[PDB]
Amino acid sequence: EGVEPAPWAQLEAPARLLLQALQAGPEGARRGLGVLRALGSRGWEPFDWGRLLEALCREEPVVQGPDGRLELKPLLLRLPRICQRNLMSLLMAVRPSLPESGLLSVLQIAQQDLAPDPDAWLRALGELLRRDLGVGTSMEGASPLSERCQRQLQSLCRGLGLGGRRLKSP
């Protein structure tokens, strides 16, 4: 009646482990690693990240909010939220070892530009991958954080006598 199979049901089996694994609470991220070493040890010694990096961006249909509103969601926002947060962890963990083409397609989504209720976390780890690639200096106020944070931290730094250190170079 209301069976849905997981979004990764149709995928090539080792993805299905990776993301099956990252479903599971905050140690998701090791388990993701655990899987990578456990598939260097099984017969497909490689894992085709360009398979998985397409699959993530590709969109499918969803009908949510009311009973009636058609939208096109990509995989990344559609799959389990804890699998998001750890994926993104793991990708700082193997950033070197992915092609750029895919990453950038991921991030752009991540940015969650032009959403109501963006996902803080994702945006942030988006930022923290941009800042590791060397292409998302972004020339903005683009730091992982909330504005409401940024300001409350300036507000308390101000209650202290500045260090003679020189760190800004105008």
Partner 1 sequence: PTMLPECFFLGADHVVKPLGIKLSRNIHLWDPENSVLQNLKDVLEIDFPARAILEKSDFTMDCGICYAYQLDGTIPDQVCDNSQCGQPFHQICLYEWLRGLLTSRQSFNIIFGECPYCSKPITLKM
Partner 2 sequence: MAQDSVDLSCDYQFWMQKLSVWDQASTLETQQDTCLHVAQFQEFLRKMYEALKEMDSNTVIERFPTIGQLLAKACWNPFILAYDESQKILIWCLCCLINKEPQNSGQSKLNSWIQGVLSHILSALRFDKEVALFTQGLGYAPIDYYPGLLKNMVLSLASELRENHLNGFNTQRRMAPERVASLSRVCVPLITLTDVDPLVEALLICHGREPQEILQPEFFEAVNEAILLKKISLPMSAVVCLWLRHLPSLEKAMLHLFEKLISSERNCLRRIECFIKDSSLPQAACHPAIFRVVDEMFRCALLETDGALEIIATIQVFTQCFVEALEKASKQLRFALKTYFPYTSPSLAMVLLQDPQDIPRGHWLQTLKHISELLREAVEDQTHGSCGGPFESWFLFIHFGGWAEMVAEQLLMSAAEPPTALLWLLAFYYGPRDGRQQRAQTMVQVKAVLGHLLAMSRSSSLSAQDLQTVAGAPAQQLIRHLLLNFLLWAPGGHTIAWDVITLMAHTAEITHEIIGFLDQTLYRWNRLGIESPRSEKLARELLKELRTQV
Report the partner that residue 38 touches, choosing among partner 1, partner 2, none (CB closer than 5 to 8 A by kind): partner 1
Binding test (CB under 8 A) with partner 2, winner from 10, 26, 60, 63:
26
Q: Per-residue x/- mask for partner 2, residues 62 to 101, rule CB under 8 A?
A: x----------x---xxxxxx--x--xx--xx-x------
**Separation in Å, CA 49 to CA 18, 81, 94, 98:** 11, 20, 11, 7
Q: Is 164 in the site for partner 2 (CB under 8 A)?
A: yes
Helix, strand, coil percent values for the chain (each to nearest 5): 50, 5, 45
Applying CB under 8 A, the site for partner 2 has a residue count of 59
Least Å distance between CB 62 and partner 2?
A: 8
Q: Which of 8, 124, 18 is nearest to 56 (CA)?
A: 8
Report the partner that residue 124 touches, choosing among partner 2, partner 1, none (CB closer than 5 to 8 A by kind): partner 2
Binding test (CB under 8 A) with partner 1, winner from 10, 26, 40, 42:
42
The tokens for 131 are 């800042």
Backbone angles phi, psi at 63, to 5 degrees: -125, 95
Q: Is 92 in the site for partner 1 (CB under 8 A)?
A: no
The tokens for 114 are 């032009």
Are 112 and 120 in contact, with CB atoms under 8 Å apart? no
Is the Cβ of residue 53 or residue 85 nearer to partner 2 in the bound state?
Answer: 85
